[PDB]
Design a protein around this ligand. Structure first.
Ligand SMILES: N[C@@H](c1ccccc1)P(=O)(O)O
Ligand SMILES: [Co+2]
Ligand SMILES: [Co+2]
Length: 304
């Protein structure tokens, strides 16, 4: 395999971390190939769930808990720490909150969160590599609690980084937030990409096409599919009681992605850097509720 950048996986991975039996497990957690029966039973479907008042409370709880765990990860970001060490604390943080780390054995994903460095677009696998000063790193957290999934991510700076790094991360965060700002009932899910790409384009960056935002509640990934690029044909119109993520990945170079031999790690084909931010959103009447927002601080971790 020809790597696209300087990054390399650092093996071996430590043995798969166990989740105590008292933690309620999603269906794929015990399927040999990590397949989710309930998600497959809605494959190809474009209809979107309308969340009941108990659904909403369940989503509000699990998303708040997911934010707490990402905050834990944020606190460990410094040169010298390995992505495996991050993952360990995260796994322990989920358990403490009586939640299952949603990525664990999700279609055989071997870890409890995704750690994506530099040219990794998303789905990086936590490994033995020490974070290096100058790196950018995204931690993607998804928790499972009482039948509901909560999903968010932030890109972080590792010590001091360069101007391009600062620009890429700030612009990515802006794309998300401008997208979130347009969310309200009656809006077409396909419009979000127009907004994201418009801002990415104006700053000289491209927008990944192979990965999309998604509905999320009783399923990890479900309807609607939410592309981050312009002129997409996403099916659906926003409604009060809809819950989905927006998670634009933006790149320094071109938009083309490819996957490592591990079957998960998505990297820019040109080896240039990529950044991502993610929130889970609930559409209300006056707009939307950012379920994965910080409660105790105004800004994302990278600008504070
Ligand atoms: N939370 C991410 C994820 C984690 C593990 C497996 C697949 C996607 P995504 O849905 O934000 O891409
Ligand atoms: Co995520
Ligand atoms: Co997601």
């Amino acid at each position: 395999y020809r790597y696209t950048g300087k990054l390399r996986p650092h093996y071996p991975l430590m043995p798969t971390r166990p989740v105590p039996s008292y933690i309620q497990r999603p269906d794929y957690a015990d399927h040999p190939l990590g397949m989710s029966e309930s998600e497959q039973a809605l494959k190809g479907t474009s209809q979107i769930k309308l969340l009941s008042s108990e659904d909403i409370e369940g989503m509000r709880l699990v998303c708040r808990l997911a934010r707490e765990v990402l905050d834990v990860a944020a606190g460990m970001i410094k040169p010298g720490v390995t992505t495996e060490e991050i993952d360990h604390a995260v796994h322990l943080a989920c358990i403490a909150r009586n939640c299952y780390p949603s990525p664990l054995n999700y279609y055989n994903f071997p870890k409890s969160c995704c750690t994506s460095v530099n040219e990794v677009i998303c789905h990086g696998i936590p490994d033995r590599r020490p974070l290096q000063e100058g790196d950018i790193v995204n931690v993607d957290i998804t928790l499972y609690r009482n039948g509901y999934h909560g999903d968010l991510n932030e890109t972080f700076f590792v010590g001091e980084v360069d101007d391009g790094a600062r620009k890429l991360v700030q612009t990515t965060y802006e794309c998300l937030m401008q997208a979130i700002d347009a969310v309200k009932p009656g809006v077409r899910y396909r419009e979000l990409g127009n907004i994201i790409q418009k801002h990415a384009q104006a700053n000289g960056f491209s927008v990944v096409r192979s990965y999309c935002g998604h509905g999320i509640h009783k399923l990890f990934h479900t309807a609607p599919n939410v592309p981050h690029y312009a002129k997409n044909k996403a099916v659906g119109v926003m409604k009060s009681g809809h819950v989905f993520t927006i998670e634009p990945m933006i790149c320094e170079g071109g938009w083309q992605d490819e996957t490592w031999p591990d079957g998960w790690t998505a990297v820019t084909r040109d080896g240039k850097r990529s950044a991502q931010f993610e929130h889970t959103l609930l559409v209300t009447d006056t707009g939307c509720e950012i379920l994965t927002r910080r409660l105790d601080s105004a800004r994302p971790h990278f600008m504070s």
